[PDB]
């Protein structure tokens, strides 16, 4: 009866920072996935457990679109079993991940002469995130052995820092918009389908 609202992600004016990635849940709607891949607009389009051209033939309980902005040469961490401060401390994909990772260069939207510093990532955490976990806390990290008790200090650090995107950066340090589609088939009725 309804079109799925994925355009609110792929045509969004602004994206989330990777530490606070947005999750949009999709249900009770139909969607034509041909429209994504036939755009050819995505320089990263890799699917795990599913096949882009077979997505119109399936139905799922839910689909989750996670969106956020990272730096060009961190895109490779958005994949099963990667390490680095993005996969470890900001957005972790499971090893059994079933879905698609989509990405594209957003230098024209997210870079400004002077530097856009509005996008942030978590540099410090006591442990890795678990798959699909989301940590938005802003408590002073303790890189030494002294309770920072809520203030930055020697070996005591605020856990977030800024990307700083300028148009003249090299591609490795240009902003990329990422959408991770997750496909979920539980015991409940599958409401998300393609033209069929």
């Amino acid at each position: 009866t309804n079109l799925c609202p994925f355009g609110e992600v792929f045509n969004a004016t602004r994206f989330a920072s990777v530490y606070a990635w947005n999750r949009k849940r999709i249900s009770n709607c139909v969607a034509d996935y041909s429209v994504l891949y036939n755009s050819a607009s995505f320089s990263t389009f890799k699917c795990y457990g599913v096949s882009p051209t077979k997505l119109n033939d399936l139905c799922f309980t839910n689909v989750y679109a996670d969106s956020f902005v990272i730096r060009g040469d961190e895109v490779r961490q958005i994949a099963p079993g990667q390490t680095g401060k993005i996969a470890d401390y900001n957005y972790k994909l499971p090893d059994d991940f079933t879905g698609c990772v989509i990405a594209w260069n957003s230098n024209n939207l997210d870079s400004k002469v002077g530097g856009n510093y509005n996008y942030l990532y978590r540099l410090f955490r006591k442990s890795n995130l678990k798959p699909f976990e989301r940590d938005i806390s802003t408590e002073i990290y303790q890189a030494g052995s002294t309770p920072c008790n809520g203030v930055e200090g020697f070996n005591c650090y605020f856990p977030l820092q800024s990307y700083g995107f300028q148009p003249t950066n090299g591609v490795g340090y240009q902003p990329y918009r990422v959408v991770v589609l997750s496909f979920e088939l539980l015991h409940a009725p599958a409401t998300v389908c393609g033209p069929k």
Partner: nanobody, 116 residues
Framework: QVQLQESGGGLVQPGESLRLSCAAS????????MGWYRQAPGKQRELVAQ???????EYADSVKGRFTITKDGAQSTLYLQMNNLKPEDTAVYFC??????????WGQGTQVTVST
């Protein structure tokens, strides 16, 4: 990849009728929603009329009963038939197309001016 051209804008007297056309082209999915929108100056873009996915038309309250929206399947044209025009219908009119549920597109708009 998807293009939309509005036509039929122009000058109309209050009480007269006018039909607008939106030719859509490019790689249009079978799953798409088209609509007509308008924007008077100083005001924000406002939904005017659309046809849901299941086919049933919907109208803004300000035009309900005076406007008719129809979709010519063969000629991929969305029509807005506007009857008993009033001076408050003066605006730039735009069509929208939501393609497959992943992208949406706008036309450039055409000017409808209602004046004696």
């Amino acid at each position: 990849q998807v293009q939309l051209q509005e036509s039929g804008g122009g000058l109309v007297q209050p009480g007269e009728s006018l039909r607008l056309s939106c030719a859509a082209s490019g790689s249009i999915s079978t799953l798409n929603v088209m609509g007509w929108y308008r924007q008077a100056p100083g005001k924000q873009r406002e939904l005017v009329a659309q046809i849901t996915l299941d086919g049933s038309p919907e109208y803004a309250d300000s035009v309900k009963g005076r406007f008719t929206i129809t979709k010519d399947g063969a000629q991929s044209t969305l029509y807005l038939q506007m009857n008993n025009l009033k001076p408050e219908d003066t605006a730039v009119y735009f069509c929208k197309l939501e393609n497959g549920g992943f992208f949406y597109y706008w036309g450039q708009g055409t000017q409808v001016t209602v004046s004696t």
